[PDB]
Amino acid sequence: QQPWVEKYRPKNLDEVTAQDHAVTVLKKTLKSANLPHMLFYGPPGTGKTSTILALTKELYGPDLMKSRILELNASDERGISIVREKVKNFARLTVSKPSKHDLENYPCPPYKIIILDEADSMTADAQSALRRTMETYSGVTRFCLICNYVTRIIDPLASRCSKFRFKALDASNAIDRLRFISEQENVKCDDGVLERILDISAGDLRRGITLLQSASKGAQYLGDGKNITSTQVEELAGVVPHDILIEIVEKVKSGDFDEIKKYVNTFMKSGWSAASVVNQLHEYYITNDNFDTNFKNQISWLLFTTDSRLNNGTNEHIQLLNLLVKISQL
Amino acid sequence: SLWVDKYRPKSLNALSHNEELTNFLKSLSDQPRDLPHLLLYGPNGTGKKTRCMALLESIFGPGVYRLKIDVRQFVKLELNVVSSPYHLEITPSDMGNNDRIVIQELLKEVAQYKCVIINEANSLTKDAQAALRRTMEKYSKNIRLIMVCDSMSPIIAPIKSRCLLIRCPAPSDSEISTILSDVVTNERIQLETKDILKRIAQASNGNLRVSLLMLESMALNNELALKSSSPIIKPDWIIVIHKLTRKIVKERSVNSLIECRAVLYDLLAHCIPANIILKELTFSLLDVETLNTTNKSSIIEYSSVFDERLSLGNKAIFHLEGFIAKVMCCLD
Amino acid sequence: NKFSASTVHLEHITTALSCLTPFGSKDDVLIFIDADGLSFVRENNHVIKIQLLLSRELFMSYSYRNETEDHMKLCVKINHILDSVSVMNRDIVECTLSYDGHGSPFVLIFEDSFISERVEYSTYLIKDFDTNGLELDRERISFEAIIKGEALHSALKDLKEIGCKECYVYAKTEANDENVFALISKSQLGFSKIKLPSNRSILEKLQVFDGDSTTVIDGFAVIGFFDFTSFDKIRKSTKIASKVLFRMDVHGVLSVNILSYPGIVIEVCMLEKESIDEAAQTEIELLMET
Amino acid sequence: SKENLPWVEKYRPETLDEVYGQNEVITTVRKFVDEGKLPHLLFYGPPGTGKTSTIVALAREIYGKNYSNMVLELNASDDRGIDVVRNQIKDFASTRQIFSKGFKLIILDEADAMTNAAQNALRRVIERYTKNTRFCVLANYAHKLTPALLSRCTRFRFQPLPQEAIERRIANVLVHEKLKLSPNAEKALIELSNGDMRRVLNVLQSCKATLDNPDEDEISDDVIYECCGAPRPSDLKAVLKSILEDDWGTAHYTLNKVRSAKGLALIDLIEGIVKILEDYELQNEETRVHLLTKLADIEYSISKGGNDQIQGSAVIGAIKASFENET
Amino acid sequence: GEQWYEKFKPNCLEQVAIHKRKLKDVQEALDAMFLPNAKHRILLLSGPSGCSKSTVIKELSKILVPKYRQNSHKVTEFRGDCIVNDLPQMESFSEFLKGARYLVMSNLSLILIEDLPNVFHIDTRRRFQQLILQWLYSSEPLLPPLVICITECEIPENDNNYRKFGIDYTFSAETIMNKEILMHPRLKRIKFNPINSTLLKKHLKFICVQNMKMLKEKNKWNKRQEVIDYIAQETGDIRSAITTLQFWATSSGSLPISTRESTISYFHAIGKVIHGSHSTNNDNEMINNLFENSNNLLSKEDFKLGILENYNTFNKGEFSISDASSIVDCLSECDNMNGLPESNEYGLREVRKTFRNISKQGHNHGTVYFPREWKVRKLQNSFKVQAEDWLNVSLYKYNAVHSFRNITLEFGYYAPLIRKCQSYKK
DNA sequence: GCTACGGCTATACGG
DNA sequence: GATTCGTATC
Numbered sequence A: 001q002q003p004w005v006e007k008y009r010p011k012n013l014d015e016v017t018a019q020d021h022a023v024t025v026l027k028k029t030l031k032s033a034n035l036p037h038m039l040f041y042g043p044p045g046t047g048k049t050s051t052i053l054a055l056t057k058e059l060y061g062p063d064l065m066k067s068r069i070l071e072l073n074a075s076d077e078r079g080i081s082i083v084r085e086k087v088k089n090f091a092r093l094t095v096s097k098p099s100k101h102d103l104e105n106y107p108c109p110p111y112k113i114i115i116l117d118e119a120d121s122m123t124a125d126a127q128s129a130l131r132r133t134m135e136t137y138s139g140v141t142r143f144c145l146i147c148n149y150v151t152r153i154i155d156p157l158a159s160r161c162s163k164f165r166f167k168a169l170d171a172s173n174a175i176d177r178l179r180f181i182s183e184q185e186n187v188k189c190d191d192g193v194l195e196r197i198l199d200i201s202a203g204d205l206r207r208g209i210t211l212l213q214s215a216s217k218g219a220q221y222l223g224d225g226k227n228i229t230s231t232q233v234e235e236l237a238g239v240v241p242h243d244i245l246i247e248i249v250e251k252v253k254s255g256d257f258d259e260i261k262k263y264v265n266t267f268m269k270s271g272w273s274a275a276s277v278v279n280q281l282h283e284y285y286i287t288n289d290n291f292d293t294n295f296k297n298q299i300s301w302l303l304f305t306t307d308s309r310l311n312n313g314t315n316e317h318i319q320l321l322n323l324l325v326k327i328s329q330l
Numbered sequence B: 001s002l003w004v005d006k007y008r009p010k011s012l013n014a015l016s017h018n019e020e021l022t023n024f025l026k027s028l029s030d031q032p033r034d035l036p037h038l039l040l041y042g043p044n045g046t047g048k049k050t051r052c053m054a055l056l057e058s059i060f061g062p063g064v065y066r067l068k069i070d071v072r073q074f075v076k077l078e079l080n081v082v083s084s085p086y087h088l089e090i091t092p093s094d095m096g097n098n099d100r101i102v103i104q105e106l107l108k109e110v111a112q113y114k115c116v117i118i119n120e121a122n123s124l125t126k127d128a129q130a131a132l133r134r135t136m137e138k139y140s141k142n143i144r145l146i147m148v149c150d151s152m153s154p155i156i157a158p159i160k161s162r163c164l165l166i167r168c169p170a171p172s173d174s175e176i177s178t179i180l181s182d183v184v185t186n187e188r189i190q191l192e193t194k195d196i197l198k199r200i201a202q203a204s205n206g207n208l209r210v211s212l213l214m215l216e217s218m219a220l221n222n223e224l225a226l227k228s229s230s231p232i233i234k235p236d237w238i239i240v241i242h243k244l245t246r247k248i249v250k251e252r253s254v255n256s257l258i259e260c261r262a263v264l265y266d267l268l269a270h271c272i273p274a275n276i277i278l279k280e281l282t283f284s285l286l287d288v289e290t291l292n293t294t295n296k297s298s299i300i301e302y303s304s305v306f307d308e309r310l311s312l313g314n315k316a317i318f319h320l321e322g323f324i325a326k327v328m329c330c331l332d
Numbered sequence C: 001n002k003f004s005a006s007t008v009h010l011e012h013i014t015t016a017l018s019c020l021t022p023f024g025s026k027d028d029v030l031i032f033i034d035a036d037g038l039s040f041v042r043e044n045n046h047v048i049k050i051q052l053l054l055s056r057e058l059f060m061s062y063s064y065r066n067e068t069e070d071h072m073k074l075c076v077k078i079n080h081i082l083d084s085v086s087v088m089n090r091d092i093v094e095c096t097l098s099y100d101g102h103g104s105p106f107v108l109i110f111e112d113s114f115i116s117e118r119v120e121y122s123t124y125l126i127k128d129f130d131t132n133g134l135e136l137d138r139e140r141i142s143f144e145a146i147i148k149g150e151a152l153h154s155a156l157k158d159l160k161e162i163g164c165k166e167c168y169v170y171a172k173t174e175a176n177d178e179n180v181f182a183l184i185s186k187s188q189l190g191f192s193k194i195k196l197p198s199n200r201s202i203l204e205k206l207q208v209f210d211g212d213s214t215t216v217i218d219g220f221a222v223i224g225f226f227d228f229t230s231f232d233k234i235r236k237s238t239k240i241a242s243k244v245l246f247r248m249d250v251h252g253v254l255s256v257n258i259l260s261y262p263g264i265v266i267e268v269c270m271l272e273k274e275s276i277d278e279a280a281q282t283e284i285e286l287l288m289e290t
Numbered sequence D: 001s002k003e004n005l006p007w008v009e010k011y012r013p014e015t016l017d018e019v020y021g022q023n024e025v026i027t028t029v030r031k032f033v034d035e036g037k038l039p040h041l042l043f044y045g046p047p048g049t050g051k052t053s054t055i056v057a058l059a060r061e062i063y064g065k066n067y068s069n070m071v072l073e074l075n076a077s078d079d080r081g082i083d084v085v086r087n088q089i090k091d092f093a094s095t096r097q098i099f100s101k102g103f104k105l106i107i108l109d110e111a112d113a114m115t116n117a118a119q120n121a122l123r124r125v126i127e128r129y130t131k132n133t134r135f136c137v138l139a140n141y142a143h144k145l146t147p148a149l150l151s152r153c154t155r156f157r158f159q160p161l162p163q164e165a166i167e168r169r170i171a172n173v174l175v176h177e178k179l180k181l182s183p184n185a186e187k188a189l190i191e192l193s194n195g196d197m198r199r200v201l202n203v204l205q206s207c208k209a210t211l212d213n214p215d216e217d218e219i220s221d222d223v224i225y226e227c228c229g230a231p232r233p234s235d236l237k238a239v240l241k242s243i244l245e246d247d248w249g250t251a252h253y254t255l256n257k258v259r260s261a262k263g264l265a266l267i268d269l270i271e272g273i274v275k276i277l278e279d280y281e282l283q284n285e286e287t288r289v290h291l292l293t294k295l296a297d298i299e300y301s302i303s304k305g306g307n308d309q310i311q312g313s314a315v316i317g318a319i320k321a322s323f324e325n326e327t
Numbered sequence E: 001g002e003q004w005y006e007k008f009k010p011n012c013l014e015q016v017a018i019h020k021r022k023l024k025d026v027q028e029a030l031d032a033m034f035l036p037n038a039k040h041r042i043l044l045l046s047g048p049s050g051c052s053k054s055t056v057i058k059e060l061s062k063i064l065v066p067k068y069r070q071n072s073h074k075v076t077e078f079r080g081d082c083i084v085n086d087l088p089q090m091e092s093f094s095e096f097l098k099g100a101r102y103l104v105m106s107n108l109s110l111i112l113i114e115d116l117p118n119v120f121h122i123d124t125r126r127r128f129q130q131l132i133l134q135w136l137y138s139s140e141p142l143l144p145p146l147v148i149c150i151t152e153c154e155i156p157e158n159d160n161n162y163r164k165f166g167i168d169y170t171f172s173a174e175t176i177m178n179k180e181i182l183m184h185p186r187l188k189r190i191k192f193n194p195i196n197s198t199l200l201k202k203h204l205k206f207i208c209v210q211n212m213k214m215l216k217e218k219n220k221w222n223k224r225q226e227v228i229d230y231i232a233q234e235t236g237d238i239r240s241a242i243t244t245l246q247f248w249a250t251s252s253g254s255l256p257i258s259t260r261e262s263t264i265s266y267f268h269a270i271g272k273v274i275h276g277s278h279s280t281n282n283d284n285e286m287i288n289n290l291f292e293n294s295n296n297l298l299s300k301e302d303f304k305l306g307i308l309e310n311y312n313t314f315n316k317g318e319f320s321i322s323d324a325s326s327i328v329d330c331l332s333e334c335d336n337m338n339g340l341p342e343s344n345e346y347g348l349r350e351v352r353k354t355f356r357n358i359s360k361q362g363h364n365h366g367t368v369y370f371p372r373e374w375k376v377r378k379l380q381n382s383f384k385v386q387a388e389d390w391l392n393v394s395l396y397k398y399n400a401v402h403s404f405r406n407i408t409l410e411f412g413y414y415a416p417l418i419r420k421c422q423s424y425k426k
Numbered sequence F: 001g002c003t004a005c006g007g008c009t010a011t012a013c014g015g
Numbered sequence G: 001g002a003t004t005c006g007t008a009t010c
């Protein structure tokens, strides 16, 4: 059939949850026709594409959508030539006349929306040609820039476009949506479940939905009919078990380089991810009251540096070994 | 012909080295319709590609292991493609940096639950992943990508969010020794004792492929026989790295640095990845008993700094030579 | 539809639209639609403007059912429209030009019994500036000359062949019934002039005024320094013309009326180069003394 | 149809008297145009300071009813290469006036994003046709311009809009939209805009949208903060106090509470803490260095993505370590 | 009433400002190329600007071409400005070379090609490379001798988008002629060197003695010696030296003497960065001048590789390991700055500062070499071909796929010791 | 019938 | 600019 992520994608603006500010601004500007240029940004999987698609289908309708909406993303070319020719020509084009049915059952605003999703991957050379393009063609065309990092957007474009930030979907934001999806999909879960799912999928709901779907499929294949336990979704996500983490901590406490290296080799043999173990080590060390302030400061900086190095695409084994040696020699 | 290919399992039930992962693959194959995008992360030599093949056979019946090799062309990027029934192979190694265009064209051609397997997804550049983060999300009704990578660290967050994370632990010593015993039972080598298989497993560091290849090499060297004192046929580049480690821990001079640079140039000419070269040099330096704990800590710190520098850099010789110079200064 | 006009002859309108080819080859054009007919206005670099008029009598089913606006304007491209009107013929292809008001494509339906081709073009917003800026002032006309189309077309073709980086316009009338009108060319070969004949067959009329359009003076020469990159924009327009009328005022604005239903009228306007060099005019005058 | 426009486009000044803030530039250009002669201008400054609304108003006031045939405008949205400069600009600036109205203004907006070859080919066009054509250059980055081009261009610097000008423009917008704004909300708008009219206009439009009744309800500070997802000063001060005084656990708990109850981003909190820490005593010179370096590194890491919890812990530890050099 | 580089021009071979060995080898090559046998067909003269690379060919042809010509004197220089009506510019050189091959007997004339066609354009560049390649491989039994004087010069910064490289950086023979032409057995590349100070002083003194009335009239004949010495020591260009001398002599005042500044070569720049400059003892001034005068050479990644491969020449490599570690660490840091000019400045300033605090008198230095990266990339391409062939034969026999990383690491080594070691048994 | 011309085309150059 | 070899000359 369809994946649960695409099956429960919000069709209308009333289904997007916890993005109350931007969605209510869009709903209120639906009644009027003064929608400004928008710059949607936030953590991945927070509901930007879903929100813009819902607004697009609400403003124009399925038939008018094709004739009044242009969508460009990283899958297609978005160079300086593309911005100069395609976007400019589309914006210059007069808005198509809506049919009687469209005017009756849809607001049909006099403007059109150019959706540039994943705009953070666009070069600054191609972002300079959009400045006047989104300004002179403002009363006949609207621009929606979607990105994950506002820093990649040049200052002029950030000033021209309205700044709508999508909040991270934590266990207190998307929990209602996750419970709705579980109830609609007939998923049996224990108490406390879907909370670990939202926590592991920090600042994201698509990962949480995928984890829920995978756990449901595993439970169905098992045939026991019992509810899904927390450890199941923890192992399924890729979270290192607590016993392995405490063994790592104990090896760190005994500041023997050879023992630490051997156990790190065994851990890399196990196949776990460096990011997850680093996050779990952060959660263990920061929360533990036994440590003092100076040690916590130093370990926080070391974990920050290790995560920064890992994000650059480095070897997990070396970074993990260096981090554990640094923690031992602290 | 090769023993690795000779004893490659061709089904989910034939896999007898993960158990729990095999059961999870059965659970995933129970409902082939709702198949999420799969990302296999684990140590090299585990058998992730074999697991993907077995899962595809479970979904698409027999004939998945078929090999319909053909040649494509992109703009002149004429990358070869390995086609199969409901199975396509994409290797980011054959197109570095310029992978975005070719993967876009291949994905749009496949779109036309077809599965396309992109091995070693870590080699994908940040632009190809930027295209894929939307390619997977948009056409998720006619194609299901399954990607296998050693470590998902250089994989962008959106791709890991849209895909499903499945871990493939490396084979354990007892089970890999059992696999070696099955190999030597199917093709008799008349092993003197089973301890040599355990030593081979220990010398493979969880790499079943390495264990099988070295077992075949030793059997061929000993004339289809095995010996308790049979030499371990390690790869040549590992021996060169060990010799370089000995040179570093013995000759602490600038001429020795030039010799080390020449050795590194030879290794790079052998098309050995720079990051793994630095990793093996570091771990071989840590295995030297003469060096004290402070020296080893400095070695690992320099290794981390210089592998980050190599990751954020174009030319690889600079970082390797800098790491060698730093460790040489630390030694004396 | 607000507008709907049907025509049987397509070669005439094809040539009329191809008269705008020497201008921007692939750019936007403005089409004014009124009761008299439809027009085509093209402006390049705000220095030259060309206007083409197609009267109602040219068509056979002109309706203009619009009532809310006296004139209806739409902006479309030129290459696509020229290619559509270049359908030629085998059975007359009756065009069905239509425009259903704001937010509607400028549809060109071609019916040839066996063929039912229909072409639609989306409309661009506006040129978004005051188009009526190149119009000459009808009070300070320096001179007014009429030249046959073939002679001017041959002269422009000759100038194009020899390069003609820059061009000059020389007009002077004498009381001895000897009128001189010629164009100077600053090309790779130097300063070359092309003297048009004084015979009435070529030059029907030449009257050099004194900046008042009423008094005719003799012995005064009006120098017009025009860039040839804009002067060759009407080279092919005069090829299909019978009589060409020249008008230049003291404001440095040239006005050329091209005429071949009362035919087709092509009204073009050109700006004059600033003529930085003072000796350039002096040397042109000295050369014209021979 | 002007009501169906964004507030940043339908509040664009049409005359020089509506361009608030840049009083010196307006007065100088008015003196220039009244005295006839206008030198080649070059407008520089941060984005949204009115570098285009000033030049277009000046062109409208000089060439009344002739803003179209006397002014040629080229921007980064169109090609400005060697061919464009050598053909279009030369043809426009080499022809005589339409009605002898004056000189031909050429507005080159966003001229910083131009190739150096074009910037060098433009200089001789500027100098050789200065009798009947005056060039205006709009650029946000001065280093992108050839030094000779800067030499042959009178430089006017559009400084960030002062508080008084933004307050006057907000008052005009309120009068035109029949809105009510609290003084605290106005100050929050001032601090959020940091010298940018477009930011203020967008935030005001979003606040009016966010109101259930845009007529009988007043835009408060809470609305101004909720519509943009910006941290209130109170939560920033609480975070700073928790990091500076309380232990590592309670500081982390307070940081998580502040970033969760309102959804505030970590980079915004970092910027707020930086701002609140500028007017601090910090007698030791090493504390300033540690704070600036560590906070810049954390901001750079955030700009590339990562684990927000780890980055927040890094912020807390960095601030604590920097303030240990105090004693 | 004309420039002094003319009029006072060489009239015989002795007057030519060229070293004895260079003259003798050029004459030997020309005499070998004029024989009925055609061991060498083209003579690729090269060198810096104004190094007597053109004035010697005419003098040689004055006493060589008539001797070996038939009975029944000068050169046939290619004019790159002749725009033929029915001839594309690419075909101009094609027609030149196709009509210059008829000068063998009774029409013998040396073909001199100093002004090359617009080789910066790729199409005509490869057309010229093909045309000269056809000349070397021509089945013609007899061909006239041909000389291509490629004046090497550092092409300045340009606005060309990519247009590959090589000809966009330098105008050397390697950037115009391809490796097949350079390594061709019938090509003889006689490179030229800047004119030595002795010959420059001799010729300047000859010019001065040929015109001394105005020199003594303007109270300059007594100051002639210092001017000649400074001109001959500042530049190695004969024509530029003569022009500067003429400008100084004809002048009447106290205008400082200035001459064209030579561009620092790659090895020269590496030596300056590593060792220093004897002229200037200020590191900042030297680095700033090096970057201002030649930024097209310090910006390429080869120069950083050059420093990495050549910093082991200081004191034959006996310097402290800490200095080497600092140098390589800073080079890696600069590599980690994506080619910013600041990284280029720092990667040389640090090296020069490090090699200044350890500068010891009486320490012999070694020789330098170009970085060994082209050999490495060629070996890597060969290994790529080997791996591709192994994977191709692997898939054709059995349906087993192997990643290129594993091929490099595991499969590649064991494949011979498995397959060929069992071929023995067969 | 041949012409002088409209459309086609091979193409050196363009950016 | 540094090294090694090589003539040529005062």
Ligand SMILES: Nc1ncnc2c1ncn2[C@@H]1O[C@H](COP(=O)(O)OP(=O)(O)OP(O)(O)=S)[C@@H](O)[C@H]1O
Pocket (backbone or CB within 6 Å): A004, A005, A006, A008, A009, A010, A015, A016, A017, A018, A019, A043, A044, A045, A046, A047, A048, A049, A050, A051, A118, A148, A169, A177, A205, A206, A209, B158
């Ligand atoms: N606020 C939300 N309410 C309901 N579902 C949501 C919300 N945000 C995200 N989702 C779910 O997330 C999936 C689609 O998210 P997207 O909007 O495509 O991702 P994203 O926000 O664009 O982030 P990307 O893909 O990294 S740019 C669907 O499964 C939605 O149900």
Ligand SMILES: Nc1ncnc2c1ncn2[C@@H]1O[C@H](COP(=O)(O)OP(=O)(O)OP(O)(O)=S)[C@@H](O)[C@H]1O
Pocket (backbone or CB within 6 Å): A131, A156, D007, D008, D009, D010, D011, D012, D013, D018, D019, D020, D021, D022, D046, D047, D048, D049, D050, D051, D052, D053, D054, D139, D140, D165, D169, D197, D198
């Ligand atoms: N002094 C001002 N008074 C009132 N509104 C202003 C003022 N300056 C700018 N604005 C508003 O801000 C909008 C954008 O300013 P512009 O002048 O068009 O662009 P800019 O200020 O030049 O910035 P860049 O560099 O072009 S992105 C205008 O359309 C006005 O609505």
Ligand SMILES: Nc1ncnc2c1ncn2[C@@H]1O[C@H](COP(=O)(O)OP(=O)(O)OP(O)(O)=S)[C@@H](O)[C@H]1O
Pocket (backbone or CB within 6 Å): E004, E005, E006, E008, E009, E010, E015, E016, E017, E048, E049, E050, E051, E052, E053, E054, E055, E056, E114, E149, E151, E203, E238, E239, E242
């Ligand atoms: N004694 C001399 N020796 C050499 N050249 C001389 C001498 N006296 C005058 N000249 C002139 O100086 C110039 C030097 O010419 P060459 O150097 O042979 O040409 P070139 O080497 O091709 O210079 P390029 O590479 O085109 S800059 C010629 O114009 C000579 O006539």
Ligand SMILES: Nc1ncnc2c1ncn2[C@@H]1O[C@H](COP(=O)(O)OP(=O)(O)O)[C@@H](O)[C@H]1O
Pocket (backbone or CB within 6 Å): B003, B004, B005, B007, B008, B009, B014, B015, B016, B017, B018, B043, B044, B045, B046, B047, B048, B049, B050, B051, B148, B179, B208, B209
């Ligand atoms: N369950 C198993 N039993 C026996 N051999 C296996 C099993 N799984 C994998 N292999 C061996 O692993 C080899 C392929 O490993 P591969 O998939 O390349 O590992 P990786 O995915 O880590 O690169 C095959 O030759 C096969 O013989």
Ligand SMILES: [Mg+2]
Pocket (backbone or CB within 6 Å): A048, A049, A117
């Ligand atoms: Mg998205």
Ligand SMILES: [Mg+2]
Pocket (backbone or CB within 6 Å): D051, D052, D053, D109
């Ligand atoms: Mg502007």
Ligand SMILES: [Mg+2]
Pocket (backbone or CB within 6 Å): E053, E054, E055, E114
């Ligand atoms: Mg010469």
